[PDB]
Design a protein around this nucleic acid. Structure first.
Lengths: 164, 140, 141, 176
RNA sequence: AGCCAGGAUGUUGGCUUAGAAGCAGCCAUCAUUUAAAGAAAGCGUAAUAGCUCACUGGUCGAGUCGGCCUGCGCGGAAGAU
């Protein structure tokens, strides 16, 4: 009388970790191979990432029973889910390894603070996802206007003044 | 036996090169197969020969030209010259230089390669329908 | 296209490899040279030792030339050797014929390093744990 | 059970003539097929025809599934067209199309001439390949079957006239 | 159920055997990134190789499958004017 627990439990386990996840990446991949998944799962667990194939039945039911950060609602076709629990960037970086090799049009979206990012836009954000180098570039635009432009200008003008 | 169906000369030539391990030189080129095997091309003059009964094979100069063969006939005629070229450094040099050469020199150069056991000239003709046997002897 | 094919599977005793059962028909057919191969083959296999059963996978270049990757000696072979026993039983482990230390299993795990599916050398060791059992070695601590 | 209930979806205004048992499909490409179906009701509907049994008959619900299949088949007929491929295998077998009559050297004493029925034509890319085009799915494969009846593929070396691609598992001769 | 896709790694497990190789035979009958793949259910160069397999995820969008009790039918069912 519906005694199978596997589908009732495994939704719950995925919902806990996918709520806990920092950045995650949602891709489509009928035409997979064992090799390409195995090496990517291998490095992923160093970086604090799992990359999973899970039922879409399971993911829709997971969105139904709790509000979801990493989705709005589930996507048609097969779905792979890369998700990261430690370094926030990491889930998307594995897609940028994988895209060089087998298939690169697989990604439907990725989620960043729960907003959905489409396939074209994610390709810029995921290329540099490390905050310290990002803080340095946000500072570099303000720092050029604040103090750099004055000092650089007077050095170029003192070189003109003592050359005449 | 080129009168027989399923016959095509060029594969047999390739089979000798591949399996047996000497270079064939097609010292003829065919005209047709099955029924259509009713003449031959002589690369040496680039003329072509016909038989009716036995007695048209008596007629033995300009009998026809090779007609609409010509594109195939060119590369094989180059391979004929190419083969006579490699029999010494001197003939090879004349070829590289940009000069042309004769049928008599073709026979002399080729004959050294046949005689030494280097190069195996391939000829063709169905015996049963009395095609090309006399041509075959001329090459011998 | 080019006369190239990759990852063709071969198993031959390390650094001595000349005759037609070791080289097959494929080296002859793909234009590959046995003598020249033997010189290349001694050059990655000396360090891990000659005369060992070697896995080797060959990738072929249409210049009549060769490259080879070795996936190191097989773990089954290496465990059998590290526990010293000559050959397993026809009822192995159930009616056993020898013994292996765990310190011996870990030594295999380092030789097969990156070519083991497990998570870490404890997981990997657990993979060759079942191979070592299969060949009839009784596991001493 | 399922596909007694897959209800056509008529593409691009096909000509549908309903006589209450007889249906005739007319168009351009796949023009003028017909079928006569008794124990079934077919309503024309919104280009999305309805198939069921006439009066809830036990033996009539099989033939409702059949009606559907022939109707979907004629739709494929006017859209796409049908089974092209015959081809001839191994030494000396060759064939020339001559109007609507196909002459084949299939190694008989007399090279055989096979002439086609009304809805269907063929032509050959080269003499060892034969491509058939025609209106009705049953008629086209019947012509493929009736040609394939001159030489069944003989399994030692596969020689014969071959419909579609694969036809035989093949076996060795002397073997062991 | 069909349709698409995956269908692995230690590893050609151990032994036996010319070969023994998932798939002649015997013994283990497990482990491993796994979402998953039996040290293998059937074919296959008898076996290297190759093909399918349960098992896994889509398309798919509803009932579905295996047993049993029991009426009735079927084939098994070929002779002498």
């Amino acid at each position: 009388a519906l005694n199978l627990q596997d589908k009732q439990a495994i939704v719950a386990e995925v919902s806990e970790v996918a709520k806990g996840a920092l950045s995650a990446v949602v891709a489509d991949s009928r035409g997979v191979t064992v090799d390409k998944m195995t090496e990517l799962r291998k490095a992923g667990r160093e970086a604090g990432v799992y990359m999973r194939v899970v039922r879409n039945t399971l993911l829709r039911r997971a969105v139904e029973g709790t509000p979801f950060e990493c989705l709005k609602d589930a996507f048609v076709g097969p779905t792979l889910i890369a998700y990261s629990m430690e370094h926030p960037g990491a889930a998307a970086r594995l897609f940028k390894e994988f895209a060089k090799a087998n298939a690169k049009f697989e990604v439907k979206a990725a989620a960043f603070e729960g907003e959905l990012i489409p396939a074209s836009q994610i390709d810029r954000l995921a290329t540099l996802p490390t905050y310290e180098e990002a803080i340095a570039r946000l500072m570099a635009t303000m720092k050029e206007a604040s103090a750099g432009k004055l000092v650089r200008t007077l050095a170029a003008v003192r070189d003109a003044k003592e050359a005449a | 036996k080129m009168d027989r169906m399923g016959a095509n000369f060029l594969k047999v030539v390739n089979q000798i090169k591949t399996r047996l391990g000497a270079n064939p030189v097609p010292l003829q080129l065919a005209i047709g197969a099955e029924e259509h095997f009713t003449g031959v091309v002589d690369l040496v003059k680039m003329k072509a020969i016909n038989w009716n009964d036995a007695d048209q094979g008596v007629t033995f100069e300009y009998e026809d030209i090779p007609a609409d063969m010509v594109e195939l006939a060119n590369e094989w005629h180059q391979n004929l010259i190419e083969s006579a070229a490699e029999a010494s450094e001197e003939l090879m040099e004349k070829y590289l230089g940009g000069e042309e050469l004769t049928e008599a020199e073709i026979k002399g150069a080729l004959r050294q390669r046949v005689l030494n056991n280097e190069i195996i000239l391939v000829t063709c003709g169905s015996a049963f329908k009395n095609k090309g046997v006399q041509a075959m002897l001329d090459a011998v | 296209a080019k006369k190239v094919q990759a990852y063709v599977k071969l198993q031959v005793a390390a650094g001595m490899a000349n005759p037609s059962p070791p080289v097959g028909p494929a080296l002859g057919q793909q234009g590959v040279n046995i003598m020249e191969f033997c010189k290349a083959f001694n050059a990655k296999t000396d360090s891990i030792e000659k005369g060992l059963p070697i896995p080797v996978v060959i990738t072929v270049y249409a210049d009549r030339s060769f490259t080879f990757v070795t996936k190191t000696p097989p773990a089954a072979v290496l465990l059998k050797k590290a526990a010293g026993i000559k050959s397993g039983s026809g009822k192995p482990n159930k009616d056993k014929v020898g013994k292996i230390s765990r310190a011996q299993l870990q030594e295999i795990a380092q030789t097969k390093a990156a070519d083991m599916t497990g998570a870490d050398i404890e997981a990997m060791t657990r993979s060759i744990e079942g191979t070592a059992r299969s060949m009839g070695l009784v596991v001493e601590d | 059970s399922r596909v007694a209930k897959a209800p056509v979806v008529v593409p691009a205004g096909v000509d549908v003539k309903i006589n209450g048992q007889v249906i005739t499909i007319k168009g351009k490409n796949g023009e003028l097929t017909r079928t006569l179906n008794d124990a079934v009701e077919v309503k024309h509907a919104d280009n999305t025809l309805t198939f069921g049994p006439r009066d809830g008959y036990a033996d009539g619900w099989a033939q409702a599934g059949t009606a559907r299949a022939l109707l979907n088949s004629m739709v494929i007929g006017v859209t796409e067209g049908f089974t092209k491929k015959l081809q001839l295998v191994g030494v000396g077998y060759r064939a020339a199309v001559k109007g609507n009559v196909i002459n084949l050297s299939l190694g008989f004493s007399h090279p055989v001439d096979h002439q086609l029925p009304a809805g269907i034509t063929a032509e050959c890319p080269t003499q060892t390949e034969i491509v058939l085009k025609g209106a009705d799915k049953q008629v086209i494969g019947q012509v493929a079957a009736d040609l394939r009846a001159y030489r069944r593929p003989e399994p030692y070396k596969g020689k014969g006239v071959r419909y579609a691609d694969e036809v035989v598992r093949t076996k060795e001769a002397k073997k062991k």
